[PDB]
Amino acid sequence: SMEQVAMELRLTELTRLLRSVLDQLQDKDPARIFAQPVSLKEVPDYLDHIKHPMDFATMRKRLEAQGYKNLHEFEEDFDLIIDNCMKYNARDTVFYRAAVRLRDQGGVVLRQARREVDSIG
After folding, report:
1. Which of 9, 58, 85, 105 has the maximal Cβ count within 10 Å?
2. CATH for the 1-121 domain, from 3.40.1280.10, 1.20.920.10, 1.20.1540.10, 3.40.50.970
3. What angle do CA 43, 33, 56 make, to 5 degrees?
4. DSSP label at 93?
5. Where is the Bromo domain?
6. Residue 78's closest CA among 95, 64, 58, 97?
7. How many helices (H) and strands (E) are present in the chain, helices listed first?
């Protein structure tokens, strides 16, 4: 149907906007602390602590399969990145501090993205 195509074009355009949001968020992580999944070889107990691991590469795989239906879903995954880190790592660690900084900086980007998704439909 023509409606299914129009829907798919909106999904595609949202994917376009989310890809740019993702690139901007990731730039707020120049150390690359959040680039890849936490290694279960190197942190063998990780899943006893963290039930839903997340990282920028796993987000990007989902993104490219057009797996985010709305901004809310994408923000849920960004928030897991930050929130998982702030639970597993103590306040006085480079990891925790990197998450705080990503959260604070990411907020700006996400605030305008919500306006753009509402604005462009």
Report:
1. 85
2. 1.20.920.10
3. 95
4. S
5. 9-113
6. 58
7. 5, 0
